[PDB]
Swiss-Prot record, chain A:
Similarity field: Belongs to the CENP-Q/OKP1 family.
Protein name: Centromere protein Q
Range covered out of full length: 109 to 161 of 268
Subunit structure: Component of the CENPA-CAD complex, composed of CENPI, CENPK, CENPL, CENPO, CENPP, CENPQ, CENPR and CENPS. The CENPA-CAD complex interacts with the CENPA-NAC complex, at least composed of CENPA, CENPC, CENPH, CENPM, CENPN, CENPT and CENPU.
Subcellular location(s) per record: Nucleus; Chromosome, Centromere
Function: Component of the CENPA-CAD (nucleosome distal) complex, a complex recruited to centromeres which is involved in assembly of kinetochore proteins, mitotic progression and chromosome segregation. May be involved in incorporation of newly synthesized CENPA into centromeres via its interaction with the CENPA-NAC complex. Plays an important role in chromosome congression and in the recruitment of CENP-O complex (which comprises CENPO, CENPP, CENPQ and CENPU), CENPE and PLK1 to the kinetochores.
UniProtKB/Swiss-Prot annotation, chain B:
Name by which UniProt lists this protein: Centromere protein U
Lineage top rank: taxon: Eukaryota
Family note: Belongs to the CENP-U/AME1 family.
Coiled coil start-end: 1-42
Subcellular location: Cytoplasm; Nucleus; Chromosome, Centromere, Kinetochore
Tissues where the protein occurs: Expressed at high levels in the testis, fetal liver, thymus, bone marrow and at lower levels in the lymph nodes, placenta, colon and spleen. Present in all cell lines examined, including B-cells, T-cells, epithelial cells and fibroblast cells. Expressed at high levels in glioblastoma cell lines.
Its biological purpose: Component of the CENPA-NAC (nucleosome-associated) complex, a complex that plays a central role in assembly of kinetochore proteins, mitotic progression and chromosome segregation. The CENPA-NAC complex recruits the CENPA-CAD (nucleosome distal) complex and may be involved in incorporation of newly synthesized CENPA into centromeres. Plays an important role in the correct PLK1 localization to the mitotic kinetochores. A scaffold protein responsible for the initial recruitment and maintenance of the kinetochore PLK1 population until its degradation. Involved in transcriptional repression.
Subunit structure: Component of the CENPA-NAC complex, at least composed of CENPA, CENPC, CENPH, CENPM, CENPN, CENPT and CENPU. The CENPA-NAC complex interacts with the CENPA-CAD complex, composed of CENPI, CENPK, CENPL, CENPO, CENPP, CENPQ, CENPR and CENPS. Interacts with MLF1. Interacts with PLK1. (Microbial infection) Interacts with the N-terminal domain of Kaposi's sarcoma-associated herpesvirus latent nuclear antigen (LNA).
Gene name as annotated: CENPU
Length: 53, 52
């Protein structure tokens, strides 16, 4: 039953229609997001220091 | 963008400093010149009056 449900869901999602878009792979989203926060903090503090000067 | 603003304001300050430095000095001898001149005039007048 689970295999039948899985294959039918594959058929349904293949038949499905969506507006065009670009998506990055699900496995690596977390790490890249973490480095993005790190870059966020570094650039924020740098800009704040420059503005203060 | 902000880095360039920092650089150019630094240039501004670096150029402005000598002008104030010169102006303060000039005023400094000008005032003393006036005071010494008035003192000398008073002294010469007094000595001339005394001798007369």
């Amino acid at each position: 039953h689970l295999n039948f449900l899985k294959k039918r869901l594959l058929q349904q999602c293949e038949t499905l229609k969506v507006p065009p878009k670009k998506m990055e792979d699900l496995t690596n989203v977390s790490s890249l997001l973490n480095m993005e926060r790190a870059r966020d903090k570094a650039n924020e503090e740098g800009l704040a220091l420059l503005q203060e000067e | 963008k902000k880095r360039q603003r920092m650089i150019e304001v630094q240039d501004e300050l670096l150029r402005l400093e000598p002008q104030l430095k010169q102006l303060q000095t000039k005023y400094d001898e000008l005032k003393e010149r006036k005071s010494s001149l008035r003192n000398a005039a008073y002294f010469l007048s007094n000595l001339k009056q005394l001798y007369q």
